[PDB]
Amino acid sequence: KVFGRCELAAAMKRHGLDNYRGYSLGNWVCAAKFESNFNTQATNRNTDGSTDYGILQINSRWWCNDGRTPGSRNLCNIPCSALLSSDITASVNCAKKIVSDGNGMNAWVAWRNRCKGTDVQAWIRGCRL
Ligand SMILES: [Cl-]
Ligand SMILES: [Cl-]
Ligand SMILES: [Cl-]
Ligand SMILES: [Cl-]
Ligand SMILES: [Cl-]
Ligand code: NA
């Protein structure tokens, strides 16, 4: 599923991401835009052989099991395919674990390089939230 900007903002808010660990909702929407272009089915292969999955491009090296990343962990205790669903619940729950682990949203390269330090509230401007 390809979300609209405000549709995704409202879904993320219902799932508890607004100000989760101090990150306002615009941060999450900006990260989703640049990681996946709001597409829950996005996948991208990394040079080390791991793969990133879903709307927040969660990586199989640490966070989910895809059966083809030898020596990886599965800290969200989910198959990576669960992260491609039109229902973002699995992605959100896993992201909450990721952002809690110490590095905050710096875990998302696109967030660091394209959202951090910008006016992220613009990403939820106009939405009925
Ligand atoms: Cl915001
Ligand atoms: Cl772009
Ligand atoms: Cl594996
Ligand atoms: Cl933080
Ligand atoms: Cl940009
Ligand atoms: Na894994």
Q: Which residues pair with 62 in a beta bridge?
A: none
The pair of structure tokens assigned to 26 is 């615009």
Q: Are strands 43-45 and 58-59 parallel, antiparallel or unpaired?
A: unpaired
Residue 52 a catalytic site member: yes
Q: Which ligand is nearest to the CA of 110?
A: 5
The hierarchical CATH code for the domain 1-129 is 1.10.530.10
Please tell me the distance from the alpha carbon of residue 49 to that of residue 120, in angstroms, as a whole number: 32
Question: Nearest 5°: phi and psi at 57?
Answer: 55, 55
Q: Which amino acid is at 1?
A: K
The full length of the chain comes to 129
Structure determined via: X-ray
Beta strands in the chain (DSSP E): 43-45, 51-53, 58-59
Largest CA distance in the chain: 45
Question: Are the CB atoms for 12 and 28 separated by under 8 Å?
Answer: yes
What are the C-alpha distances in Å from 79 to residues 20, 24, 33, 60?
A: 24, 28, 23, 9
Q: Kindly give the distance from the C-alpha atom of residue 10 to the centroid of ligand 5, in angstroms, as a whole number.
A: 22
Please tell me the distance from the alpha carbon of residue 33 to that of residue 115, in angstroms, as a whole number: 10
Task: Give ion ligand 6 contacts, CB < 5 A.
Answer: 60, 65, 69, 72, 74
Please tell me the distance from the alpha carbon of residue 36 to that of residue 21, in angstroms, as a whole number: 22
